[PDB]
Design a protein around this ligand. Structure first.
Ligand SMILES: O=N[O-]
Ligand SMILES: O=N[O-]
Ligand SMILES: O=N[O-]
Ligand SMILES: [Cu+2]
Ligand SMILES: [Cu+2]
Ligand SMILES: [Cu+2]
Ligand SMILES: [Cu+2]
Ligand SMILES: [Cu+2]
Ligand SMILES: [Cu+2]
Lengths: 333, 333, 333
C-alpha cells in the first residue's frame, strides 16, 4: 500500500511518568504516527547524597517518553542528535521488525538527524533503547531507553475477552546504574566519556548496580511527584527495564490483570501480588483502587527498593472501607 | 454486612514445613478466621559451621507459619510483641488490600499487641512480612516473613476446570541472609541491633546472599526432618521468597501443575521442570509421586542450592516402576 | 508392556547448535530410542583473550548435544566415561522420573560405562546435566549439561490448537563460567582438578559469572558459525541454562510463539520481545523471519551479552520489506 495515502498525526510527547493523550479504541483507520525526539547528554543527580552522573537521554528524561500507537499503525520517528552532544547514538525498537530494531538505520553523529518508519505489527508494550555497535550496555545503562505501547485496535481485553478500560495510565521506567567505585567504595568521577569508558565497563561487569531508580532518581516518584488516583479508578501502570530483571509490587494492592511480559494477544495473569518483568522487556499491570491512602510501588527485591532506590508512591483519595480492612484493636500495651 | 453475625473459628498454627489442618473445599459459609502470632527475636544457628545470627521471627520460626483460609473469609490476626524483644515490628499481608497490606495499622513496640482484620478477597498463596518504615529489608532478611494461602471456596482446579485435590501439603520458606563480612571474608558479629544496622545495610547492598536456606538453616529439611510421601500421593508444595527470586525444582520429579506466581484464578502451568518464583511472591506446585526413593528439592541455581543452602529432601516410600526408569546395564568396566 | 517388543532406533547425534534429524509428527508408534554419549574432559579456550579452562563435556561440546524423542518413547542412553578422564560423572535428565533423574543409577568412574532407560512421559524441552553427589554445581558450571526435546506425538500446536511446524531448529546452550580470580582480578590457573576445587567453590559462591557464553565460547555463534535462515522460514530456537536465569531476545525480531519454561502441553506466549528462562530450564521460541540481514540473538542483560559473551548472530537471506521498516531520511547533517 501507498503509505502516502494514509492519515498522518503528529504526537507531542510528555515527560514520564505521564503519557501523551491517545485513544484506547482506535477512532480512525491505520495512521502514520509522527514522533520527534531530541537526544540530550546531560548531568543528572540521581540520589540524596548528590551523586552526579553523565546521563544519556531521549528527550531529556530518564526514562525516555512513552510513545503510544495502535496495531498496524506506522511509527515515523525523527531522531535528532544536536551538535551540543558528543557521542554517536541510534535507536532500537523492540516493537519493530528488521535492522536490529532500527539501530542499523539510525546511527546519528552529533549534528545529524534521521527519520525511521516501521509498521507496529504486534500489540503490547515494548522497550526501545539506544544500541551503538560495541557500546550498547553503556548507553542503555546511562539512561538511554524508554518504551512504546502498541494498543490493539479494539483496546485491552481480560482473560475472557471482555473489555478492560483504564481511567489513568502511568509509565514507570526502572534504571540500573553502575557508577564506578574505587577500592574503598566511593564513586569515582571522570573528565570525558572516553576516560570514563573502561571503568564504566569494569563497573558494569560486576553485575551489581549501585543505584536502581524509578523516573531517573531516588525519590523521583514521591512527595509532590507521587502518583495519584482515587478509589474506584482503573489505573494501568506500564513498567520497563531495558537491561535487568525487576519484580514490581503495589504495597497494599495487587495487579488485578497483569501482562508481565507485556504482550496483549495473551490473556493477563490475574490477582498478582508481584510479577517478573525480565530485563529487556516492558510489562503492564491494571488495578482498580479500593482503599485510599499512601501506597508504595516497588521492585520487591526490598534491598533494591529501599536501599538502592526502586520505590515510588501513590497517594489515593477517597473513602476507607472497613469491611476490607480495619484495625480491630489499635496497638496498645 | 455485620461481621459480628459470622462464625468465628480459631486456628492453632503449626511450625513449618507442616501446615495447620484445613478443608480444601469450604464446608461452611464465610468465617472470621482468628490467628495469633507472637514475635520472637532470637539467636539462630544457620549453617554447619555454627554461624549464629540474630533472627527476627513470627512465632519462633523461619519462615513464619502458613495461615490457611478461603476466599472471602476475614483474617483476624492478634499480633503480640512481648517486652522481651527490643525492636518495633508490624505485618504486611500481600493478600490484603489497604494500609500497606496492614503495616500502617500494626506497628507494635515491645510490650504492645494489636488486632488487624482484613477480607481475603483474592485466592492464591501470598507472602506476609514485617515492614517497619525505614528498616524494611533488614527485618525481612532477618527471617521475618511467611505466607498465607487463600483457597478458592471450591478448592483447586486444573487448566480444564477439573478438581485437583492434594493428599499432603508442605510449606517451604526460602530465606536469603546477608551476614556481614570483614575484608578477609569472615562473618563479623555485633553486640546490639543498632551497632549491627549499618554493616547489615552494607551487606544487603552487595545483593549477594551469604546463605540461602529452607526452613531456617542449611540442612533443615533433611535427615530426620526430610519431607515424606508415598508413591501415588498428591502433594502440594507452597514455596515463598519474600525478597529474592528463586527457581524451585524437584530432582527426579516435576511440577505437574504449577502456579509459579501463586494465584489460583489462573490456570496452572503443566509439566514444569523448574519454575520462577519472583522475590516478593509465593508459588505452589502440585505433584503426584510415581517413584520411591530420595528426591532433592532445590533452588536450581545449583550454587545457591548446594553451596549456599537452598536444598531439602523428600523420602518417598513404595514400589519401584522399572517401566518408567531402569538401569539396563549397571556401571561397570 | 514388554519393552523388548518395541522398535529400536539408534540416533547419531550432532554438535550444537545443529540438531539430529527427526520427525515432528511421529511416523511410528512408541520406540526405544538409543543414544550414546562419551564424556570428555578437555581444555577449552572460552574468550578472545585466550582464557583456557578445564571443561567437562558430554560428547566433546559445550553444551552437550540435543537429544530428540517423542512423548512416551523410551530413551536408552549408553554413557561412557573413558579411562583418559580423571573424574566420576553421571547424568540427570529433567525429562525423567525417579532416581534423581537418573543420577543415582549412572555413576561412572573413568573406565566404566552404563546404560540407563527411562520413559519420556512429558512433552517439552528439558535440561540434562551431570550431578555427582557433593560436586554438582562444579560439574554443571564446567560445561556438563545439554538438553532433550520430547515432542508431542502430533507435533507442536499454537494457542488455538492449530499446528506449528518449524523449517529449521537450532539449540543454543548458554553457559555461566566462574573462573577463579586473584585479588587483582586476574584469572588464576590450577594444576589438577583437586587443587582447583576450593577456589572453584569460592568463585561460584560469588554468584557472579566471569563469562556467559553460547555454544561454549565468546563469539561461537558468529562469523562463519552464525546461525542462518531465509525470509519466510519458520525457525525454532531451543535455549537452555542449567544453572542461572537468562532472558533471550532476537534483536530485530520476536518470539512469535514462546514456551519460556519449555513445556508443550501449555499454550505458548505470543509476540514476546524477551522471555525469562529460569536457571535449570530449557525453553523454546518459534519465529518466522520477515526481513533479511544480520540479527543478534542475546541474553538481554546487555552486560551479560556484550561484555560477558552471551550473544550470537543470525544471517538471514532474502528480500527487504520497506512497508515493515524503512529509512525515510538517512542520517545527515
Ligand atoms: O509488601 N511490601 O513490602
Ligand atoms: O536436577 N538436578 O540438579
Ligand atoms: O534490542 N537490542 O538490544
Ligand atoms: Cu546512545
Ligand atoms: Cu534490546
Ligand atoms: Cu520486624
Ligand atoms: Cu511485600
Ligand atoms: Cu561430571
Ligand atoms: Cu537439575
Amino acid at each position: 500500500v501507498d503509505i502516502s495515502t494514509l492519515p498522518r498525526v503528529k504526537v507531542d510527547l510528555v515527560k514520564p511518568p505521564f503519557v501523551h493523550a491517545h485513544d484506547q479504541v482506535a477512532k480512525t483507520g491505520p495512521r502514520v504516527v509522527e514522533f520527534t525526539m531530541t537526544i540530550e547528554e546531560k548531568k543528572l543527580v540521581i540520589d540524596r547524597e548528590g551523586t552526579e552522573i553523565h546521563a544519556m537521554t531521549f528527550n531529556g528524561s530518564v526514562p525516555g517518553p512513552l510513545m503510544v500507537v495502535h496495531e498496524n499503525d506506522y511509527v515515523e520517528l525523527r531522531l535528532i542528535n544536536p551538535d551540543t552532544n558528543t557521542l554517536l547514538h541510534n535507536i532500537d525498537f523492540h516493537a519493530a521488525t528488521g535492522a536490529l530494531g532500527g539501530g542499523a538505520l539510525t546511527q546519528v553523529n552529533p549534528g545529524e538527524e534521521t527519520t525511521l518508519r516501521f509498521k507496529a505489527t504486534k500489540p503490547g508494550v515494548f522497550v526501545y533503547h539506544c544500541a551503538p555497535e560495541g557500546m550498547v550496555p553503556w548507553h542503555v545503562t546511562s539512561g538511554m531507553n524508554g518504551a512504546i505501547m502498541v494498543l490493539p485496535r479494539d483496546g485491552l481485553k481480560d482473560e475472557k475477552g471482555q473489555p478492560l478500560t483504564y481511567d489513568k495510565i502511568y509509565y514507570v521506567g526502572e534504571q540500573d546504574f553502575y557508577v564506578p567505585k574505587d577500592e574503598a567504595g566511593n564513586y569515582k568521577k571522570y573528565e570525558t566519556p572516553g576516560e570514563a569508558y573502561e571503568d564504566a565497563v569494569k563497573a558494569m561487569r560486576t553485575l551489581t548496580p549501585t543505584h536502581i531508580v524509578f523516573n531517573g532518581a531516588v525519590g523521583a516518584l514521591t512527595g509532590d511527584h507521587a502518583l495519584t488516583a482515587a478509589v474506584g479508578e482503573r489505573v494501568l501502570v506500564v513498567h520497563s527495564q531495558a537491561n535487568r530483571d525487576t519484580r514490581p509490587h503495589l504495597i497494599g494492592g495487587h495487579g488485578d490483570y497483569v501482562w508481565a511480559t507485556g504482550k496483549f494477544r495473551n490473556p493477563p495473569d490475574l490477582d498478582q501480588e508481584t510479577w517478573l518483568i525480565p530485563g529487556g522487556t516492558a510489562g503492564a499491570a491494571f488495578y482498580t483502587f479500593r482503599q485510599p491512602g499512601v501506597y508504595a510501588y516497588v521492585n520487591h527485591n526490598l534491598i533494591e527498593a529501599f536501599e538502592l532506590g526502586a520505590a515510588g508512591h501513590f497517594k489515593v483519595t477517597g473513602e476507607w472501607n472497613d469491611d476490607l480492612m480495619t484495625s480491630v484493636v489499635k496497638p496498645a500495651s
